[PDB]
Swiss-Prot record, chains A, C, G, H:
InterPro entries, sorted: CALM/Myosin/TropC-like (IPR050230), EF-hand-dom_pair (IPR011992), EF_Hand_1_Ca_BS (IPR018247), EF_hand_dom (IPR002048)
Keyword Membrane: no
Family, similarity comment: Belongs to the calmodulin family.
Record's comment describing the protein's domains: The N-terminal and C-terminal lobes of CALM bind to the C-terminus of KCNQ1 in a clamp-like conformation. Binding of CALM C-terminus to KCNQ1 is calcium-independent but is essential for assembly of the structure. Binding of CALM N-terminus to KCNQ1 is calcium-dependent and regulates electrophysiological activity of the channel. The C-lobe interacts with KCNN4 channels in a calcium-independent manner, whereas the N-lobe interacts with the S4-S5 linker of KCNN4 in a calcium-dependent manner playing a role as calcium sensor and gating the channel.
Gene3D superfamilies to which the protein is assigned, alphabetical: EF-hand
Record-listed Ca(2+) 2 binding positions: D55, D57, N59, T61, E66
UniProt crosslink position (Glycyl lysine isopeptide (Lys-Gly) (interchain with G-Cter in SUMO2)): K20
N6-acetyllysine modifications at: K20, K93
Protein name: Calmodulin-1
PTM (free text): Ubiquitination results in a strongly decreased activity. Phosphorylation results in a decreased activity.
Record organism: Homo sapiens
UniProtKB/Swiss-Prot annotation, chains B, D, E, F:
Gene3D superfamilies, sorted: 1.10.287.70
Name this polypeptide is given: Intermediate conductance calcium-activated potassium channel protein 4
UniProt activity-regulation remark: The channel is inhibited by clotrimazole and charybdotoxin but is insensitive to apamin.
Role summary: Intermediate conductance calcium-activated potassium channel that mediates the voltage-independent transmembrane transfer of potassium across the cell membrane through a constitutive interaction with calmodulin which binds the intracellular calcium allowing its opening. The current is characterized by a voltage-independent activation, an intracellular calcium concentration increase-dependent activation and a single-channel conductance of about 25 picosiemens.
Intramembrane zones: 215-235
Species annotation: Homo sapiens (Human)
Residue positions where Phosphohistidine is found in the record: H332
């Protein structure tokens, strides 16, 4: 956090524009208000998704470090961290992220591509510390990203 | 109730008179054409055929005058019987008197016989002026449609403000024939305009008065390139060429609405096209995701084993696959947003139906 | 009523088009339906109007002689009978056709035109059989049409 | 409340001079037209009237100068009394002073008496610069129109932030009847541009003066046909030809939406035409169904009793009838879909009326 | 259920025949554009080469005739199998018979071996007429596409009640990428039209029969300029250049819609632009208000102190600040009022959502 | 969090290098034009000025080499730091290698010293190729604007995702003020095209290749008129004039958006004008009714006694005022229908507000 | 039913596209859902018409043989079987298919076409096995088609 | 009030146009009616605002002298009286016209402009008769305008 004073002032200006209330912090109701002001139809479910995906430490609403880090994100044009989400997002036929690893591997390792015969399944099973399988993105991410 | 029968008889008589007017105008223009070109093709020593043609055209104009007088008398009779009065003189007024006098003097002019193929370009002006009879055609064609006779059409026009008397047939013809008559008129005007242009250049052995040489500049005058090899600079030639140019450039601006309508796309097939675009994009996205994961696993393979130039190339391939995935996702998002947008009429119909069905 | 048989058939065809029901006679409700099918927003007041001028003898709905006579009307392009209707319409400031004849004459005989001094008022008063004045179009029409 | 009366007096005084501006425009034109025609169409020996013409036009320029000074004084007085100040100096500023100087120098440049009928080089450039006074018409017509005079118009416009200052009169003049004004503006400028084209091409019978062969070149360039029979070789002639061509091609734009607007098609005739097509289409469908059923029944006798080529011809006719039936069905379906759609305004009005009438 | 398999086999055979037709048309066009060039290039003493070329052309025409007969026979076969079929001679559609006879006679005419070059102008008319074979590509291209084979395609399209006989492939191709093939066609037609004009402009010694010279006077058209460095004096040249001019005028209306479509402006960009405008305008309003208040305080401070010429400039500064404030306010109102009511679809969607959420 | 600072520094360096790139391109074109002008005007080989100029332009190209090398290297550095990686050539700009090599060889080619006016095209082709440096304008202008630098704008644009890579600055510039730059561009490219047409056409006087004569013809081609006074006989001249003609005719499709939606007529003036016409038509109808009633009374007065020519004239005047009343009525009806039926947005907003206020 | 395996797979793909649920079979509610997704305003009456005209053996919803046969139909561009359907609907003035055969024949055998005098009526009466007349398309179809 | 008779008649015509009722005076309900006829969505709060600046002496609705004076206003293109209104509205962050004078002066005397150091604050404090400060536009207007 070695931001220069001019950049601190610029980000403070941005935060002031975002925070219409200024008690320091706009609340979810006026998050939805400004979102619909931009011209999007708001839903309470998606607003809850927004707030509980941006908030941390259970403080609620918005926080200055939280805003600073989420603005540290969404600036890189491309990456291999926040764009590999699809690798577990798209193959969830059930959609809750609890579909069997063996079944998804078998059904998705044949779309014009073939890799091995159950060796990939064995490797996936051994990758998990507890051998959970199913949809366990922690071990897969630990193996892939680093 | 006899007014209805009287009006029907008046309209029938008007139709007959309009038909006779059109056919006699055709005979007159045919006689004028026959008299023309005789000096430049043939010989003047016959001394009888031209006299017979002139006398026949004189009788034709006399009968045309008589039928025009009869038609105007019948229409003023129709006006009188519509506005029920008992005075012959009260029907006439300034406007109709001016109109009938103008029609008479238009018909009044007539190329009459006086008693090498060089007519002097001054004695044929009256014969050339017979083209003015073109305005007598719309009056006949509008009434000759027969749409006015159907009582049901007038009934439906009632209980509403339409007052269809003129431009109504034009609108109906444009609706039923967007360009069918337009193309024919545009293609047929060229012969007449070349024929009327080949009068001022009628100079003996000038290589310009002939019809074949004449029918070269008008197509390019209607066009825009107009390099102008002929460059005719005779008397009134500048006015004639300017008129041809202005009418041509006015007529250039068309065909755009009809070609757009023909190339237009109906919503019925648009729906199924969007549906299949959705399914194809889903297939493409699944294929891209499979490619991404397949390339990703090999990186961990080379991480477990020794890394090398192959591992570096596979990293490059992984980046390329990520870029392709992003492109496919962006395109699918664009198409989905587009299809979700618009759809105004169907969505409001559905929402109003739901509101009606909600009741209490 | 000397209509020829062919014209009788043509008008019968028109009547068949107008009468969708064919019990011989469409009713005010489906008068409104067809009128809105022509694309005019219907009001019950104007439908009751339409029907109460078109109907005669208290028969209701529509009648063949009534249909024939109203189609005998609405065919002449112009006249001096059905267009002079406004002479008692445009000068009804109250709008009920019961405004004083003297007042309307005084207020409307000065719009860039002058005719006499109370001679017109005396003539109007004498024209009425009972000297009603106000808006009595019966005597005016009697002295106008014939 | 004397401010309103003083403002009305100021506007009356401004009207008293706006008309005289265009009144003196006539003698401004006469400054150049008569001198230019006389110097070339007659001998130079007519030196007894040149001095009188010069003194008269000098007096005219002096009168125009006084008129402009008076107009500017009255308008700055209006500005002062509107702002409700007292100091004379505070009213003036840089912008209006610069405008005053520009107007003075525009009207200041006038030909003056110096003391074979050939105009030496550009000795008439000062008279040519007088033609710049063409931008006086829009201000004069804006201030002369009575729309700004009425109090009710400003009263209504005040509550809607309309700012009656400029371009409102232009918008209304375009709205009331666009065709006549634009046509007149396009037609009038041809004479002026033809007149100004011959500024140095007169020479001495060089076949480029006498105001002839110059009224012809400009319309040819405007029509974009470009015959190119003769081309002005002078640099000034070249640039004036280029600018008249670019302005002609600029004016060529538009002038085509007028026919589309006139050929409009309102709701009432739309609905009556749709009713007409509906009855025609059901009649055609009934006729086609009768035809196909009669053909099918006719097929039965040859089905029962075999023959030669009769069954074949009957089958051919049956197929033709089926094809015609399909065509009629498809066309009717298209028309029904079209009439069902594009009813958004009427449908929403009807549904909102139904919702209002539902109540509880 | 064997009808499905029979139709699939028929479609596969039709695809094979269409492919062979296209490739043999390519062979025919390859055998063209050499017979004409051989006479004009070098000499014609090698009669064996021209004899072999004519023999090969005859064989190619015979094979094209055979394949066309096979294709149309299989089309008749599929049409016959579609309906209740008994005999080969049953259907034999008369219009289809006329079409196949017309196709035969179009293919019937062909250059033939008869037994100082450039072939003059009389002979080889049939050889020059082989350009008419261009009509085959539109028939082959749509059937070449595999969209017809997809069962899901017609399955979903059936419930929409739209026919897929023709022109929907063209609509889909236009929708996929407008202008893509349009630009290619426009750039490729020039070579063909120059080549066909070369024969009309062919001359023994004049500098008009060369391909390079012929390649220039067509591009002068379709540019609406027409410099006219050369003029085609041949009547066939006249009609062909008139045709090129009219087609160029027709095609000049291109790219105009798609450039605007590419230069469009989506709702997201307009929303962020309005956000930028809001922030910038409130900032500018605050700055202007501060400026005008500070100027007013400056004037008030210098009212009672040092009352002299120095304080005069402050009043003009105050008026300038007031005018700037007025302009800023007017612009802000102008844009805010427009953007408030700009949203219609989103506004009514929100309104109906609120109405639904209201419930009871 | 230092990635933000590193990216900001990289963007600042990229902007500085883009500015220096534009400066060096300007220096290069300035050095190139002067040699071409000097070799043909003034002293041909009066001194070593030509050698000095060639050396200077060689040094300028040498600096440009390293300048674009640094620019692309910093772009690759930005791409490297965007993706967390620890390898120099892991990205290496695989596909972009072709682009960077192509741009390098475009910059690499340059006029070079070899060691009367006899200019040769072979030695001047490299100098003529310097016009390709114009490609740098978008790259410099994209970084010139400071919108990309602001963090709050990217903050607000993250939601409702819109990528900002390209065409966004063009859209903003077009929407801010469409009329600012297109006219300047059209006026500016004329000088460049005239100069490039003058180059490689100055054989030996011959009234060709000089700037003055060649500058005139290009605007004629752009205006799409043509005169044919002089044409470029060179094949390079032919292709360059064809290119100028095609770009000019492409540019003619313009000013349509300048006139439309700019000569528009918005809600406020529409409403006040409708009120204006409403009251005016009310007054006109009242006047017409008064006139017709007065004429009726006049007819009564001259009907009670002395029926004569005066009574006939009064009947004529009554029939005159009748249907004039009807014309006024019809016009008022048309206007009232148009005003009542065209209110869509305001009417739906009012009806939805009424529905919301109804509650239960 | 000798369809080739590749075409079986293609039709299985089509069936998978049609059956979003995949219990093997979408139900009438989501038939209407997908139909309105195609952009048509649905009515329960027309949905019931669809489902009962497509279903057979009382199984309900959709069936694989039923789907196969109705896709065997709707592929022929023209025919004399499913296009002669109008011959018994266009002449049903009452609209329920129970209008008298003699009356319809008399009223529809005169629109610019004349065949015979009661011979057609006698033939129609004799065609029916029970002489039902009225609207009995079974006998007419058996006589005409084959 | 030296208006001439012709101008009196013209303004009476304008008043007749404005007053549809003619009891002499339209009421706030039909003020809103005509305002929405002009095409503006009306709110009761803004209608009450309008009427309670335009009305005087508690007479209500509209008055002829009130109409005359408000039309005497809004005819000057620009001035220094009715345009300096923003000087006390643009700096009211709270928006009720009761924000502290010292605070607003401190926060708004730095937007790229600087005048003095507390001298302006002392002058503003001394300008008020009672030293109210805050937002007291009476004293400021009396000091500035005259
Ligand atoms: Ca806050
Ligand atoms: Ca009935
Ligand atoms: Ca299922
Ligand atoms: Ca009142
Ligand atoms: K054009």
């Amino acid at each position: 956090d070695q931001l220069t004073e001019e950049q601190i002032a610029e980000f403070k200006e941005a935060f002031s524009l975002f925070d219409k209330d200024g008690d320091g912090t706009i609340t979810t109701k006026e998050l939805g208000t400004v979102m619909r002001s931009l011209g999007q139809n708001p839903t309470e479910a998606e607003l809850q998704d927004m707030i509980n995906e941006v908030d941390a430490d259970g403080n609620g609403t918005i926080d200055f470090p939280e805003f600073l880090t989420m603005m540290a994100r969404k600036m890189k044009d491309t990456d291999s961290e926040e764009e590999i989400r699809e690798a577990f997002r798209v193959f969830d036929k059930d959609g809750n992220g609890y579909i069997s690893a063996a079944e998804l591997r078998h059904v998705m390792t044949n779309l014009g591509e073939k890799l091995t015969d159950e060796e990939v399944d064995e490797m996936i099973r051994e990758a998990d510390i507890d051998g959970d399988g199913q949809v366990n993105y922690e071990e897969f991410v630990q193996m892939m990203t680093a | 109730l006899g007014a209805l029968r009287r009006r029907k008889r008046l309209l029938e008589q008007e139709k007959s008179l309009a038909g006779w007017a059109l056919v006699l105008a055709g005979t007159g223009i045919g006689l004028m054409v026959l008299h023309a070109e005789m000096l430049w093709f043939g010989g003047c020593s016959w001394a009888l055929y031209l006299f017979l043609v002139k006398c026949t055209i004189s009788i034709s104009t006399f009968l045309l005058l008589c039928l025009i007088v009869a038609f105007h008398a019948k229409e003023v009779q129709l006006f009188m019987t519509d506005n029920g009065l008992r005075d012959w003189r009260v029907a006439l007024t300034g406007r109709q008197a001016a109109q009938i006098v103008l029609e008479l003097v238009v018909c009044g002019l007539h190329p009459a016989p006086v008693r090498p193929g060089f007519l002097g370009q001054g004695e044929a002006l009256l014969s050339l002026a017979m083209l003015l009879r073109l305005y007598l055609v719309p009056r006949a064609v509008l009434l000759r449609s027969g749409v006015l006779l159907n009582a049901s059409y007038r009934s439906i026009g009632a209980l509403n403000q339409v007052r269809f008397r003129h431009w109504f047939v034009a609108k109906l013809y444009m609706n039923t024939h967007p360009g069918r008559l337009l193309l024919g008129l545009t293609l047929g005007l060229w012969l007449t305009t070349a024929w009327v242009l080949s009068v001022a250049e009628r100079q003996a052995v000038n290589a310009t008065g002939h019809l074949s040489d004449t029918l070269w500049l008008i197509p390019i005058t209607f066009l825009t390139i107009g390099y102008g090899d002929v460059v005719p600079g005779t008397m009134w030639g500048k006015i004639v060429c300017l008129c041809t140019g202005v009418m041509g450039v006015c007529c250039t601006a068309l065909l755009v609405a009809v070609v757009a309508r023909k190339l237009e796309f109906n919503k019925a097939e648009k729906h199924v096209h969007n549906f299949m675009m959705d399914i194809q994009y889903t297939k493409e996205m699944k294929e891209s995701a499979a490619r991404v994961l397949q390339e990703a696993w090999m990186f961990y393979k080379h991480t477990r084993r020794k890394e090398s130039h192959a591992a570096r190339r596979h990293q490059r391939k992984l980046l390329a696959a990520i870029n392709a995935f992003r492109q496919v996702k962006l395109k699918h998002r664009k198409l989905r947003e587009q299809v979700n947008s618009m759809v105004d009429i169907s969505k409001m119909h559905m929402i109003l139906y739901d509101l009606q069905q909600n009741l209490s």
